[PDB]
Enzyme design. Structure first.
Site, PDB file in Angstrom:
ATOM      1  N   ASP C  73       0.759  -1.255   0.000  1.00  0.00           N
ATOM      2  CA  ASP C  73       0.000   0.000   0.000  1.00  0.00           C
ATOM      3  C   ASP C  73       0.776   1.282   0.000  1.00  0.00           C
ATOM      4  O   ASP C  73       0.424   2.219  -0.700  1.00  0.00           O
ATOM      5  CB  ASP C  73      -0.970   0.067   1.179  1.00  0.00           C
ATOM      6  CG  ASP C  73      -1.935  -1.102   1.222  1.00  0.00           C
ATOM      7  OD1 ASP C  73      -2.411  -1.536   0.148  1.00  0.00           O
ATOM      8  OD2 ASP C  73      -2.209  -1.587   2.345  1.00  0.00           O
ATOM      9  N   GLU C 199     -12.535   6.897   9.000  1.00  0.00           N
ATOM     10  CA  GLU C 199     -11.533   6.976   7.937  1.00  0.00           C
ATOM     11  C   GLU C 199     -12.197   6.817   6.589  1.00  0.00           C
ATOM     12  O   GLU C 199     -13.358   6.460   6.511  1.00  0.00           O
ATOM     13  CB  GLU C 199     -10.447   5.910   8.101  1.00  0.00           C
ATOM     14  CG  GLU C 199     -10.922   4.483   7.913  1.00  0.00           C
ATOM     15  CD  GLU C 199      -9.790   3.458   7.959  1.00  0.00           C
ATOM     16  OE1 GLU C 199      -8.665   3.812   8.376  1.00  0.00           O
ATOM     17  OE2 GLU C 199     -10.029   2.293   7.583  1.00  0.00           O
ATOM     18  N   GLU C 200     -11.459   7.182   5.547  1.00  0.00           N
ATOM     19  CA  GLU C 200     -11.900   7.081   4.161  1.00  0.00           C
ATOM     20  C   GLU C 200     -13.304   7.634   3.890  1.00  0.00           C
ATOM     21  O   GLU C 200     -14.116   7.002   3.236  1.00  0.00           O
ATOM     22  CB  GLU C 200     -11.777   5.622   3.695  1.00  0.00           C
ATOM     23  CG  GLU C 200     -10.341   5.215   3.348  1.00  0.00           C
ATOM     24  CD  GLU C 200     -10.204   3.783   2.850  1.00  0.00           C
ATOM     25  OE1 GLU C 200     -11.143   2.993   3.025  1.00  0.00           O
ATOM     26  OE2 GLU C 200      -9.134   3.454   2.298  1.00  0.00           O
ATOM     27  N   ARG C 216     -15.667   4.991   6.911  1.00  0.00           N
ATOM     28  CA  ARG C 216     -15.324   3.636   7.233  1.00  0.00           C
ATOM     29  C   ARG C 216     -14.781   3.615   8.648  1.00  0.00           C
ATOM     30  O   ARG C 216     -14.081   4.536   9.088  1.00  0.00           O
ATOM     31  CB  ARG C 216     -14.258   3.110   6.245  1.00  0.00           C
ATOM     32  CG  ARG C 216     -14.045   1.615   6.328  1.00  0.00           C
ATOM     33  CD  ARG C 216     -12.582   1.204   6.417  1.00  0.00           C
ATOM     34  NE  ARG C 216     -11.906   1.231   5.133  1.00  0.00           N
ATOM     35  CZ  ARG C 216     -10.966   0.365   4.748  1.00  0.00           C
ATOM     36  NH1 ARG C 216     -10.603  -0.653   5.514  1.00  0.00           N
ATOM     37  NH2 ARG C 216     -10.420   0.487   3.548  1.00  0.00           N
ATOM     38  N   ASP C 217     -15.199   2.607   9.385  1.00  0.00           N
ATOM     39  CA  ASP C 217     -14.718   2.384  10.732  1.00  0.00           C
ATOM     40  C   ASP C 217     -14.103   1.006  10.509  1.00  0.00           C
ATOM     41  O   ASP C 217     -14.795   0.036  10.194  1.00  0.00           O
ATOM     42  CB  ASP C 217     -15.865   2.324  11.762  1.00  0.00           C
ATOM     43  CG  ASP C 217     -15.411   1.836  13.168  1.00  0.00           C
ATOM     44  OD1 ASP C 217     -14.289   1.302  13.339  1.00  0.00           O
ATOM     45  OD2 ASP C 217     -16.214   1.950  14.116  1.00  0.00           O
ATOM     46  N   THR C 221     -17.098  -1.665  14.132  1.00  0.00           N
ATOM     47  CA  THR C 221     -18.448  -1.926  13.672  1.00  0.00           C
ATOM     48  C   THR C 221     -18.559  -2.091  12.164  1.00  0.00           C
ATOM     49  O   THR C 221     -17.657  -1.731  11.417  1.00  0.00           O
ATOM     50  CB  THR C 221     -19.362  -0.743  14.088  1.00  0.00           C
ATOM     51  OG1 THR C 221     -20.723  -1.039  13.769  1.00  0.00           O
ATOM     52  CG2 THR C 221     -18.964   0.525  13.373  1.00  0.00           C
ATOM     53  N   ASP C 248     -20.983  -1.488   5.360  1.00  0.00           N
ATOM     54  CA  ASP C 248     -19.553  -1.808   5.368  1.00  0.00           C
ATOM     55  C   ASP C 248     -19.358  -3.252   4.948  1.00  0.00           C
ATOM     56  O   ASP C 248     -20.323  -3.973   4.761  1.00  0.00           O
ATOM     57  CB  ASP C 248     -18.971  -1.589   6.763  1.00  0.00           C
ATOM     58  CG  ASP C 248     -17.514  -1.174   6.732  1.00  0.00           C
ATOM     59  OD1 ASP C 248     -17.014  -0.916   5.621  1.00  0.00           O
ATOM     60  OD2 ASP C 248     -16.882  -1.069   7.816  1.00  0.00           O
ATOM     61  N   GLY C 270     -12.183  -4.746   9.873  1.00  0.00           N
ATOM     62  CA  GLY C 270     -11.949  -4.441   8.480  1.00  0.00           C
ATOM     63  C   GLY C 270     -13.066  -3.547   7.987  1.00  0.00           C
ATOM     64  O   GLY C 270     -14.022  -3.239   8.704  1.00  0.00           O
ATOM     65  N   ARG C 298     -15.199  -8.771  -1.314  1.00  0.00           N
ATOM     66  CA  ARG C 298     -15.249  -7.591  -2.192  1.00  0.00           C
ATOM     67  C   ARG C 298     -15.692  -7.967  -3.609  1.00  0.00           C
ATOM     68  O   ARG C 298     -14.943  -7.784  -4.595  1.00  0.00           O
ATOM     69  CB  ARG C 298     -13.880  -6.867  -2.231  1.00  0.00           C
ATOM     70  CG  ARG C 298     -13.067  -6.932  -0.965  1.00  0.00           C
ATOM     71  CD  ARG C 298     -13.012  -5.624  -0.218  1.00  0.00           C
ATOM     72  NE  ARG C 298     -11.794  -4.871  -0.507  1.00  0.00           N
ATOM     73  CZ  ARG C 298     -11.148  -4.099   0.366  1.00  0.00           C
ATOM     74  NH1 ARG C 298     -11.542  -3.993   1.624  1.00  0.00           N
ATOM     75  NH2 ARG C 298     -10.073  -3.449  -0.019  1.00  0.00           N
ATOM     76  N   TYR C 333     -13.521  -0.511  -3.767  1.00  0.00           N
ATOM     77  CA  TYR C 333     -13.929   0.814  -3.342  1.00  0.00           C
ATOM     78  C   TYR C 333     -14.966   1.430  -4.273  1.00  0.00           C
ATOM     79  O   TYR C 333     -15.045   1.092  -5.429  1.00  0.00           O
ATOM     80  CB  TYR C 333     -12.740   1.755  -3.284  1.00  0.00           C
ATOM     81  CG  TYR C 333     -11.862   1.594  -2.084  1.00  0.00           C
ATOM     82  CD1 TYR C 333     -11.809   0.389  -1.378  1.00  0.00           C
ATOM     83  CD2 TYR C 333     -11.039   2.637  -1.680  1.00  0.00           C
ATOM     84  CE1 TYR C 333     -10.945   0.227  -0.304  1.00  0.00           C
ATOM     85  CE2 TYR C 333     -10.171   2.490  -0.612  1.00  0.00           C
ATOM     86  CZ  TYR C 333     -10.129   1.290   0.068  1.00  0.00           C
ATOM     87  OH  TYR C 333      -9.267   1.161   1.116  1.00  0.00           O
TER      88      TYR C 333
HETATM   89  C1  LIG Z   1      -3.240   4.789   3.749  1.00  0.00           C
HETATM   90  C2  LIG Z   1      -3.457   3.298   3.563  1.00  0.00           C
HETATM   91  O1  LIG Z   1      -2.583   2.516   3.914  1.00  0.00           O
HETATM   92  N1  LIG Z   1      -4.630   2.905   3.064  1.00  0.00           N
HETATM   93  C3  LIG Z   1      -4.959   1.526   2.815  1.00  0.00           C
HETATM   94  C4  LIG Z   1      -6.082   1.038   3.723  1.00  0.00           C
HETATM   95  C5  LIG Z   1      -5.892   1.029   5.233  1.00  0.00           C
HETATM   96  O2  LIG Z   1      -5.303  -0.201   5.611  1.00  0.00           O
HETATM   97  C6  LIG Z   1      -7.205   1.115   6.072  1.00  0.00           C
HETATM   98  O3  LIG Z   1      -7.817   2.343   5.857  1.00  0.00           O
HETATM   99  C7  LIG Z   1      -6.905   1.014   7.592  1.00  0.00           C
HETATM  100  O4  LIG Z   1      -6.224   2.151   8.121  1.00  0.00           O
HETATM  101  O5  LIG Z   1      -6.353  -0.289   3.338  1.00  0.00           O
HETATM  102  C8  LIG Z   1      -6.919  -0.436   2.106  1.00  0.00           C
HETATM  103  P1  LIG Z   1      -7.571  -2.160   1.871  1.00  0.00           P
HETATM  104  O6  LIG Z   1      -6.452  -3.127   1.969  1.00  0.00           O
HETATM  105  O7  LIG Z   1      -8.608  -2.272   2.934  1.00  0.00           O
HETATM  106  O8  LIG Z   1      -7.991  -2.193   0.449  1.00  0.00           O
HETATM  107  C9  LIG Z   1      -5.876  -0.018   1.093  1.00  0.00           C
HETATM  108  C10 LIG Z   1      -5.365   1.393   1.387  1.00  0.00           C
HETATM  109  O9  LIG Z   1      -4.245   1.676   0.610  1.00  0.00           O
HETATM  110 CA   LIG Z   2     -15.927  -2.084   9.597  1.00  0.00          CA
END
Ligand SMILES: CC(=O)N[C@H]1[C@H]([C@H](O)[C@H](O)CO)O[C@H](P(=O)(O)O)C[C@@H]1O
Ligand SMILES: [Ca+2]
Ligand SMILES: CC(=O)N[C@H]1[C@H]([C@H](O)[C@H](O)CO)O[C@H](P(=O)(O)O)C[C@@H]1O
Ligand SMILES: CC(=O)N[C@H]1[C@H]([C@H](O)[C@H](O)CO)O[C@H](P(=O)(O)O)C[C@@H]1O
Ligand SMILES: CC(=O)N[C@H]1[C@H]([C@H](O)[C@H](O)CO)O[C@H](P(=O)(O)O)C[C@@H]1O
Ligand SMILES: *[C@@H]1O[C@H](CO)[C@@H](O)[C@H](O)[C@H]1NC(C)=O
Ligand SMILES: *[C@@H]1O[C@H](CO)[C@@H](O)[C@H](O)[C@H]1NC(C)=O
Ligand SMILES: *[C@@H]1O[C@H](CO)[C@@H](O)[C@H](O)[C@H]1NC(C)=O
Ligand SMILES: *[C@@H]1O[C@H](CO)[C@@H](O)[C@H](O)[C@H]1NC(C)=O
Ligand SMILES: [Ca+2]
Ligand SMILES: [Ca+2]
Ligand SMILES: [Ca+2]
Ligand SMILES: [Ca+2]
Lengths: 390, 390, 390, 390
Positions: C73, C199-200, C216-217, C221, C248, C270, C298, C333
């Site tokens: 990532d 987040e996100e 996103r949490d 939850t 989610d 997750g 997914r 996503y």
């Molecule tokens: C900045 C960063 O690393 N973002 C990564 C996030 C991150 O792990 C979650 O937001 C937890 O903080 O994961 C996703 P995924 O694997 O769920 O597709 C890929 C993103 O590139």
């Molecule tokens: Ca979740």
């Protein structure tokens, strides 16, 4: 509306120098990942804010599988293409303007005029496009391969002058000039003088009232036909250049042709399109020319200059100004063009460097550019850097 | 704001001539380094300052690995794409407008209107985009493959007219016309006359009050359905063309269909989209058409013209004007379009030259363009230059 | 100067329909001649006259030799890139904006604001670019992978709001919002409410005074955190969505989480970034959401809508509107964005369809777009058409 | 007409941060389908609305067949090329400006000035292009490889200052400065002070009346020559930097050179072009520099800053600000440039990361960019990600 274009005084300078090299085949290796187009007969024409690099492509690229027939001159696949000067003419970078196996183009200060000839040999057709629209056409009059300049046309006040010719490569090919405005032929001009064979003229403005062209006579002489077209009266006269410095190829030793200016001399069957561009000063007029270093072959290219006088009558040798391309390198067609600077025009000479390896492989060309810049003497020559076996 | 577009008088001319050839597959050799897209159903539509070359791609290139299914017509991958007229439609040069297995596009003088149909066969959907925004949609009414023109739509004063149809390829497919303004459907038009089967219409302005279209009837006749749409009243009527010169493919010998104008004749199941474009004069109206040289196969393409008269009633044969594509070459769909010149419109006919090599290899097309230019007779034909085995 | 941008009323429509598919890997075959970039986390952001398609690339293409690490990532090679919506994101078509392993972008009606985070995990850095200039930066406050949205930021009157977060993926990650004007941070906003893990966020304008985000949490939850940011007071509050339709992934059966709205339920460690976009009417407010068809994986993507009410308190299930992507296809996503039409805004939902084949091969994505258009029911789904073995 | 450009106050900031990486060779794999150009000596120059990334190419790409000679410095194939900052410099994306084996470029707020030197070693030529026109030239004065900056020239009010030098790499090379306006040399400036060897200057505006440059002395010292050019009087003086923090490569331990500021110390034959950029405040002046981490080799790159004082006399060590490139990575030439933001200028340092693998393979470079942004400490370094064996 943008004002029309008019020739101005040339920019200050007393010498030409190496400016730019467009060698698309440096990226044509079997191993590479590029798509340079297969071309010949390139030229350049500039508008007020950009120069375009035109050529006739065989609608094929290197690497590729359509090399058979790329040495043939006329066919149903050839097209007039262009890129902005400075870009490599690739499959994707090029714009295809029209089907043509002979072309010309020019800008009147408002729009582009594309000229392209195609059609069967015995009844070819000059087609004219203005911007995005097909506007006019002109028919063959001698029914033997009607064709045009292979260099820029010349516009003044919205009127663009173009040379066309028709006739036998080995006989009479009397040329005519077309006066075009906004894509349509407004006048047809039949020249006077020595007219038996004039083709592939490289024309330019000597002033606001005269357009001069150095042409090719493919069958009767190694002396180049020289045109004086009075824009004011729309009358043209042609006489052979009198210089001891024969500018065609093939040609005999300099000054070997005895007799007055008008004497053709031996036939020396064949020719080559030659570079010619004007350097306009308030008082003087500089005429710059280019010719192959070999009298017999298309190798090398020399620059020559000559101030004032009358080409039709001065027998004096031209003054060598420099070697733009050495004999080890290809020196094929050459043409002249002018770059529009803020308040003056910049004269330049372009050179076609063909990669010839026979009828069994591809046949294409690089384009080297030399422009008048600064003073001194011409410093460096041009090489293509291409290995045809890669 | 830019003024709206209106049809003007056509430019001076009395003949069509070969103008341009877009053969992307000349650069698709396994050995090459290009990426031409796999397309079919190309057309051209022009705005005031540029023409675009549209097509429905299979979202695959040559060379490539997604040739299986490129002969299939409708699927979830097809997209309407375009390039500026003159550029090779490559993976990188193209813009993807929307998912569609049937399309159309036009410019109202201010913005582009993209039309694309997709969705399941029994419930397809006409989607409309204006510039960058998705604006409207239209549902299937006969629940049997709703589809559209495969050529430009026609705008006047900001109102764009488009033909859509729905129904069985082998039965009734009654068409409707949609009046669209700024991306949204403002009116729905149900035509009168002979309506049993009208599809793939090639429409154009015969004047400021009438839009005429030559269409395809896939199941009942080799005579083409002809539409007269009065823009003033928003009413349309359809009747079959009466000419002895049957313009569909397949078709029987000329004038072999006995009976009055309205007689269908034998079914001759199948058809082809035909070229049709207007030449507007102050007094006359020229109607230019194109059809395959073979009565049975999609090979060759002939030009025909006919001044004035009434298509619905004149039985007279059309006047052959020239061979644009010989029988040795593919002659598939053809369409008409007009280039906007400074003060007049230029009528043109485009031709789809499909490279068909079976269901086991790629299936794509070249686009040849012929426009009205100058006078005389049509001089040269078009070939693709493609060897499908490379 | 161009006026600033403000949210308007959405365009007329009652359903979303399939609009466009950007599948660059349809041209990545070993046999092909293309260079699609290896990306993940794509989004779209539009200005008044154009939409851009952004993504975080691994600075590698297919075919290529830098597949190892494309599933990782964060690294020193990732960059935020973009192309005009509609162009295939290739090596040459893309513009590289800045080094970043997390991004966002938006246009204020005058210029583009590019947001990109990079730096070591324990001390990451939010960097801001305005047009061509690097203008501001923001430091990590929880020293555990500072990161941002992965979707467009939202501007009003020249003020752009952006969500950033910092903290443990498996613990507390309290988010903050940044008020930016002309590339520089003018305010920092600390939200109230349920703040343990946000987040996100996918944010949008519900009106001229409120910005709402579905987030996103990742640790507590399967219910999505929902933000209400009052632009007038620059105050934000967060509470979990109360709908039985958990948005989610992973998640438990619908309505399986017992307790009042605030109950987290099981951890379901997750998450996934979810699509969310507003449909503004004079009286009503439509909230459109998307979620994977699989509760655990997914795969697939469903559309849902819900008019009015209060997300923080309504327990009612959302209304299924359609299947955009079937379970056989990847559904990763999703994000929302709006296209600016002449006098109204068009809401759209984008979907990331990742081609996952393990850690031993390349890892990249297609982007499918669905927008509100016309009425009726959602007609067709999206497939990538990519065979990872070619 | 657009107003002329003048240096403004720098934008608020107190630290540099990693901004962008242009690594074209990440797409040069034999397996790939790209065409990155083979370059060296890259720099960046910005106009008011765009930055261009310039370089001297060997007119060859990777993969390709013209690797022999790409380690050679001067030849007849080298050309000055550029792309918009952010685009990968490929065969098709690049524009070829002119033939040159040494270059410079700058924008006066109205147009681009391209500087390129070529010609035989004993009589090289500085050629000047303004926009599309070749405007002026300058001859060699020491007849030993006339050459220029390899970084942006500096314009103020339409007057652009450029450093040229001539002389032996291992002896005297006295530099001169050229005052150019609209493509033509209006003044020649002969500097005072310590003049024995000054080359490859990196110049910038310290204010509206002074241009300062950190240069390279290839034969007499590891201390960098420092120029102060008074734009008002057109007079220049040069003295060596007095800092204990020797900025050339190779160099001895810091502060190991005993004696007053003027002492050269040991010869330490050789050098490297160094980064140098100004940070202008209302009261202070920040001078940012970069140097390799290795005292002997071209690996790594460190940032240093120093506020106020006088470079010619302050012996104090510079303040380390960060590691932009670690010792495991290549750290070759570095240069400074400024991005024009709405109302302030942004100082940046670019770094050339050459992929050197010997004389038997290709030789090219990546370009890393660091700009002043926000406050804090410099967070992350740059790596190219290129495996020369692919
Ligand atoms: C900045 C960063 O690393 N973002 C990564 C996030 C991150 O792990 C979650 O937001 C937890 O903080 O994961 C996703 P995924 O694997 O769920 O597709 C890929 C993103 O590139
Ligand atoms: Ca979740
Ligand atoms: C229209 C046309 O055919 N032009 C061709 C001319 C032509 O033969 C001569 O002008 C005699 O008419 O020859 C030259 P070349 O072989 O001398 O290079 C190539 C051109 O393509
Ligand atoms: C929407 C659609 O399917 N159009 C297809 C039509 C269609 O069958 C006929 O119009 C009958 O309805 O066929 C042609 P073709 O095979 O004759 O070239 C190809 C088109 O793609
Ligand atoms: C015009 C020119 O030849 N410049 C070259 C200079 C030159 O040798 C020194 O400035 C001494 O004059 O060397 C460098 P490098 O090998 O140190 O990287 C490469 C440059 O291309
Ligand atoms: C040609 O005429 C125009 C004015 O009509 C003038 O501006 C231009 O300088 C003239 N050219 C020459 C060479 O004198
Ligand atoms: C159509 O109408 C406009 C004015 O409304 C006119 O300019 C144009 O020439 C008309 N077209 C024709 C064919 O008469
Ligand atoms: C937001 O405010 C502007 C005027 O300041 C207005 O034009 C726009 O329509 C408003 N948006 C909404 C959703 O009402
Ligand atoms: C330089 O001068 C111009 C006015 O001539 C001014 O706008 C600019 O801010 C000045 N630069 C500095 C650093 O003061
Ligand atoms: Ca001759
Ligand atoms: Ca390309
Ligand atoms: Ca039929
Ligand atoms: Ca040194």
């Amino acid at each position: 509306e943008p004002e029309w274009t008019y020739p101005r005084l040339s920019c200050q300078g007393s010498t030409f120098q190496k400016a730019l090299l467009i060698s698309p085949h440096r990226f044509g290796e079997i191993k590479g990942n590029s798509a340079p187009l297969i071309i010949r007969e390139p030229f350049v024409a500039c508008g007020p804010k950009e120069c375009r690099h035109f050529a006739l492509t065989h609608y094929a690229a290197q690497p590729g599988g359509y090399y058979n027939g790329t040495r043939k001159d006329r066919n149903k696949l050839r097209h007039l293409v262009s890129v902005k000067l400075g870009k490599i003419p690739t499959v994707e970078n090029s714009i295809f303007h029209m089907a043509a196996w002979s072309g010309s183009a020019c800008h009147d200060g408002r729009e582009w005029t594309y000229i392209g000839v195609d059609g069967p040999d015995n009844d070819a057709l000059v087609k004219i496009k203005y911007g995005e629209a097909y506007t006019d056409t002109y028919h063959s009059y001698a029914h033997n391969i009607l064709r045009t300049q292979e260099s820029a046309c010349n516009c003044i006040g919205g009127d663009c002058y173009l040379m066309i010719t028709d006739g036998s490569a080995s006989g009479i090919s009397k040329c005519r000039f077309l006066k075009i405005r906004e894509g349509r032929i407004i006048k047809e001009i039949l020249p006077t003088g020595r007219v038996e064979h004039t083709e592939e003229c490289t024309c330019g403005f000597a002033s606001n009232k005269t357009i001069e062209c150095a042409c090719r006579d493919n069958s009767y002489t190694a002396k180049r036909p020289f045109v004086k077209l009075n824009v004011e009266t729309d009358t043209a006269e042609i006489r052979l250049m009198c210089t001891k410095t024969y500018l065609d190829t093939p040609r005999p030793d300099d000054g070997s042709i005895a007799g007055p200016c008008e004497s053709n001399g031996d036939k020396w069957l064949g020719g080559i399109k030659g570079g010619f561009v004007h350097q306009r000063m308030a008082s003087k007029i500089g005429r710059w020319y280019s010719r192959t270093m070999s009298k017999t072959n298309r190798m090398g290219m020399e620059l020559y200059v000559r101030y004032d006088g009358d080409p039709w009558t001065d027998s004096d040798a031209l003054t060598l100004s420099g070697v733009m391309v050495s004999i080890e390198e290809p020196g094929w067609y050459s043409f002249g063009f002018e770059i529009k600077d803020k308040k003056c025009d910049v004269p330049c000479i372009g050179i076609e460097m063909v990669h010839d390896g026979g009828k069994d492989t591809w046949h294409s060309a690089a384009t080297a550019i030399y422009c008048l810049m600064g003073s001194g003497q011409l410093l460096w020559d041009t090489v293509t850097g291409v290995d045809m076996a890669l």
